Every structure is written in C-alpha cells, then in structure tokens.
Amino acid sequence: TSPLLHPVPGPSPDGYVRLSEGALAALVLDHVASGLDPSLLAELRDNAIDARLAGYTEWHRTAGAGVAYVTVGWDWYLERATGTFVIAGGDVRSNVMAIDAKGADIGMLRTAAALAARLAALDWPAAVASALLGHND
Amino acid sequence: TSPLLHPVPGPSPDGYVRLSEGALAALVLDHVASGLDPSLLAELRDNAIDARLAGYTEWHRTAGAGVAYVTVGWDWYLERATGTFVIAGGDVRSNVMAIDAKGADIGMLRTAAALAARLAALDWPAAVASALLGHND
C-alpha cells in the first residue's frame, strides 16, 4: 500500500537499528532529557579535566511507518575555559549499528563517531543548556 | 513569607541535594525516560546474566519552593526466567547525597541503596515497561 501504512520496523533481532553512513548524516534526533551528574563532575576533575558542569543527555527519533525508534544518549561536560560542551570520551550510547556500502556492520567505535558528528550538526549543546535552565523552574 | 514564596533551593555547592534517610523514604519521583541498550544487553549476557532486555531509565522530582530538583537514573535488565526487572549492580546515579541524624554524609553506596529501596516502593518496573511499550508507537 502507501508508505503511510508500511510496517513500523523494530530493531534487527540482535537489538540494533541498522543505518547507512548517509542515513545517519540525515538522522532527525530530538532532545528528551538532560541532567547534572555531580559524581561524574568530581570524577572528570580528578582526571585533570577543568569542567564547570557534567551530566547526561537522552535524545530520540520517534517511530513511524518505515522509520524505527532510535535512542542516543551520552555523558557531557562543560569546559570552564572555553564554555564549550564536550561529549565525554566521544562515547555515545545508542540502539544504532552503522553499516557500510556492502551492508556490513562497521562496529561500535565508527558508529559512535558518526553519531557524535550528526549530534554536532544538530547543535546538541543548545538543547542541553536549555533543558538545564528549565530544571531550575 | 508563606512557604509558597520560600527560595527554590539548588544543590549544595559540591552539587548534591542533601536529604535524610526519612526524607528519601518519602521522595516523590516521576518517570522521565526509558530506553533499550543492546550493547548493555550483550554485555550482561557475556557475564552469564540471562536477560531478555536491558536499558536505561531517568526519573526526577521537579523543583518548587523549598524543594530542590532531584535526578535519579540507572541501568536495568529484565530477567528471562522470572520476568523481574532488576537494577543492574544496584548502581543508581543521582544528584543526591544521603545524610545521617547528625547531618553528616553517608556516602555514595548507602545513598544508592536508600534510593534503590525508594524506587522499589514506587514500583519503578511498571513505569519503565509502560514507556518501553510507548516507544513502539
């Protein structure tokens, strides 16, 4: 039938949503939640990182016809010097597995890298700081 | 003035909201977000845990007059055998520091334990499973 009645796909049987390098560069993610982690903040400061704040953030792409539900979360810190928001260790947790041109997996490390790059194009620091201000209300 | 205009308290200067054992047993937490982590799920299965699903969950207590904003998050898994939801390692991440009768800190380990106990009284598995079903829509 019409794409509007196409099945809502779930992940692959192993739990990952498989997306190409290109499909990942156009991934539509929305901010869901952000918060402060004082234990992470002390932890980073102990490892010589000059961080003002540290915390978590959760982002998602809602499910629809031929569009699987995607979750992307990571730890961040706000540098004191520059005021720049940083993805701690470039580590990104998600339900995504990035695949190549032949459709083969490219692994966790290249997947997290492609997602961290899409997140920077989505100006993820603007929505994190915004939510952090919303919590004080 | 009236308690309705009392200051909205923020955390202590070190970033923790200090709450007594009793105040923690009456903590009003609401579910914010839950999602699946297939990387955690494989990770637990690799360590001989028979888990059907694994993921994250984020809970909070909204700020108000004389009421600080509280965040509580943890990793969970759903046991295959029993169908029981489990806090992975009993580890709980929050902006809370539990204090004793003299007002002294009782540390991370006793804080996480008091929060995991409050979470069980709030029937946290019911809201996690509910949100997980909501994502497939």
Automatic annotation (TrEMBL), chains A, B:
GO terms for molecular function: identical protein binding. This is DUF4902 domain-containing protein. It comes from Burkholderia cenocepacia (strain ATCC BAA-245 / DSM 16553 / LMG 16656 / NCTC 13227 / J2315 / CF5610) (Burkholderia cepacia (strain J2315)).
